[PDB]
Design a binder for this molecule. Structure first.
Ligand code: HEC
Length: 124
C-alpha cells in the first residue's frame, strides 16, 4: 500500500533464503528454489497456516489461522518483525512458537515488501 514496491522487491532478497514466489502456472517471480518456508504467491488475504503444499507449519501458526488470521498489512508487518512474539499475542497462548527464525529489523522494509506482494503475489 503506501510502501514502495520496487524497494520492496530488493528487500525481498533476504527472504529468498527460505521462501519463493511461484505462480499457479509454475513461473518463478522471485526466489532461488528454497523450500524452508511456504510459497508466498497468493499470501495476500490467505488464512495463515494453509498453503496446500507446505508440510512444515508449526502448531502456533496453524492455531492462529484457525482463530481466523488472514494476512493483511498490519498483521504481516508485526509478524515479520518478530514471528514468535506475534504468534504468542495473537494466539493468546504464551507457549506458542514460530518455526520462522528470521526477524526483519526494519519496519519500512516490512511495509515495502508488503507493497511488492500486493503487486506480484495476489491470486485471482
Ligand atoms: C527461513 C530462515 C526463513 C526466512 C529467511 C524467512 N521466513 Fe518466512 N517463514 C519461514 C517458515 C519456516 C515459515 C513457517 C512459520 C511457522 O511457524 O509455521 C514461514 C512463514 C512465513 C509467513 C506465513 C505464510 C503462511 O503461509 O501463513 C510469512 C507471511 C512469511 N514467512 C514471510 C516472510 C518474509 C516476508 C520474509 C523476509 C523478510 C521471511 N518470511 C523470511 C521461514 C523463513
Amino acid at each position: 500500500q503506501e510502501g514502495d514496491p520496487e524497494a520492496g522487491a530488493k528487500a525481498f532478497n533476504q527472504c529468498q533464503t527460505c521462501h519463493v514466489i511461484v505462480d499457479d502456472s509454475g513461473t518463478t517471480i522471485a526466489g532461488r528454489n528454497a523450500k524452508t518456508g511456504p510459497n508466498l504467491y497468493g499470501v495476500v488475504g490467505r488464512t495463515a497456516g494453509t498453503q496446500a503444499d507446505f508440510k512444515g507449519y508449526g502448531e502456533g501458526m496453524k492455531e492462529a489461522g484457525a482463530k481466523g488470521l488472514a494476512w493483511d498489512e498490519e498483521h504481516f508487518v508485526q509478524y515479520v518483525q518478530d514471528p514468535t512474539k506475534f504468534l504468542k499475542e495473537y494466539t493468546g497462548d504464551a507457549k506458542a512458537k514460530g518455526k520462522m527464525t528470521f526477524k526483519l529489523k526494519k519496519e519500512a522494509d516490512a511495509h515495502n515488501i508488503w507493497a511488492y506482494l500486493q503487486q506480484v503475489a495476489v491470486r485471482p
